[PDB]
């Protein structure tokens, strides 16, 4: 499968080199190859998979937003022909393909083999995120279903995280941050977004006293993102 002939450990090593070189497309292709070896991923390997695809899809989303804004201004205007729409559609189809690829890795077979809370929550958060990126560009018959798929993945991850992880766990925090962004941006539920961000921040605050200095730094960095959104939204 392009990477089928490369050793798992060599794909992991090359994904780390690609990260250092800021070659995120290559990094994602190496990590897809590693997942397709069929073994579960370690904590560090899950992080490499997520960093790779978030950077690839992040560049696509930024480009889609530039193009979408030009297309909307063109629809306010001298008719420039079909090119702005065509090129926005090109970038959109590419973005959808990357999201479908990640969702396919999660469904075949990362989630079903993930039994520990840390891995299962991590993958379900990714599933919510990539359906959220699909929802950002969705306009047709399936838009509500894409939004519900994001909601359902985030909700399952939240339910496990609240039962199995402390309120300062960084994955639990990042999940709550992203589900709160889903509520605000995608589900048109700003009050739910604000409530979730506040409750997550406050419950983490109350558990910081249990942490080492390094864990404190990890948790407080994500708490600051929650507070930055609360400042933006209130």
């Amino acid at each position: 499968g392009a990477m089928g002939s490369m050793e798992r450990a060599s794909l992991i090593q090359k994904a780390k080199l690609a990260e250092q070189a800021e070659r995120y497309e290559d990094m994602a292709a190496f990590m897809k190859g590693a997942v397709e070896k069929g073994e579960e991923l370690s904590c560090e390997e899950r992080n490499l998979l997520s960093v790779a695809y978030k950077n690839v899809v992040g560049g696509q989303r930024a480009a889609w937003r530039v193009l979408s804004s030009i297309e909307q201004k063109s629809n306010e205007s001298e008719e420039k022909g079909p090119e702005v729409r065509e090129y926005r559609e090109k970038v959109e189809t590419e973005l959808q393909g990357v999201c479908d690829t990640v969702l396919g890795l999660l469904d075949s077979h990362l989630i079903k083999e993930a039994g520990d809370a840390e891995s299962r929550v991590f993958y379900l958060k990714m599933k919510g995120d990539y359906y959220r990126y699909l929802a950002e560009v969705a306009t047709g018959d399936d838009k509500k279903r894409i939004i519900d798929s994001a909601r359902s993945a985030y909700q399952e991850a939240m339910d496990i995280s609240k039962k199995e992880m402390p309120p300062t766990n960084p994955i639990r925090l990042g999940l709550a941050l992203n589900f709160s962004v889903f509520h605000y941006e995608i589900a048109n539920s700003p009050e739910e977004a604000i409530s979730l961000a506040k409750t997550t921040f406050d419950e983490a605050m109350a558990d910081l006293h249990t942490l080492s200095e390094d864990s404190y730094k990890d948790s407080t960095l994500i708490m600051q993102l929650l507070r930055d959104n609360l400042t933006l939204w209130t």
Binding site: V51, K54, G174, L177, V181, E185, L225, L232, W233
Partner: peptide, 9 residues
């Protein structure tokens, strides 16, 4: 105006 989702330090 766009909010922060999780990102690397």
């Amino acid at each position: 105006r766009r909010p922060s989702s999780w990102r690397q330090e």
